[PDB]
Amino acid sequence: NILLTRIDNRLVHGQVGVTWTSTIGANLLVVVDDVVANDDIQQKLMGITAETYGFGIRFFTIEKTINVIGKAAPHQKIFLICRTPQTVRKLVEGGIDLKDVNVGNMHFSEGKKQISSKVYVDDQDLTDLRFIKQRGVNVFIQDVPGDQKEQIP
């Protein structure tokens, strides 16, 4: 059911989320993020994007996603969007079978190092990305479809 998981600090990220969703042929975008899930006014803009382009959307905590994602019905073709690799790691640890993780926008903060045009990491981010890889997940950096895919160092 899960077609792709993308890490993007901007979550749905407007036209970027639109293009990914269309390209992979998802019909349900699950935003896995505790802050947004738990403060529902923060959902409104992303909800408008879903409404505009005609795909379903959910805003779930990590705990909820672990608990329910397996109940997904055959017709649900899911695109998971996560803020950070920390979230993805929690999903993997919780036993969710992810095949591919696309690393999108990871913005600078103090001490982070640039590894791709739109990706800045600290050592914990690299640790977590590498953990995900070690669990057999294909992890790659790619801004939008058709860009050259880049590997984690």
Tokens 């993308």 sit on residue: 6
Dihedral sign computed on CA atoms, order 25, 60, 147, 18: positive
The reply to whether 107 belongs to the active site is no
Question: Beta strand pairing status for 119-121 and 113-116?
Answer: antiparallel
From 59, 63, 45, 50, select the one nearest 20 (Cα to Cα): 50
Q: Encode 62-72: b = buried (16+ Cβ within 10 Å), e = exposed.
A: beebbeebeee
Question: Among the options 13, 58, 83, 90, which is catalytic?
Answer: 13
Q: Name residues whose C-beta falls within 8 Å of residue 144's C-beta, 6 or more positions apart in sequence.
A: 16, 19, 20
CA pair distance 100, 140, nearest whole angstrom: 8
Q: Which residues are catalytic?
A: 13
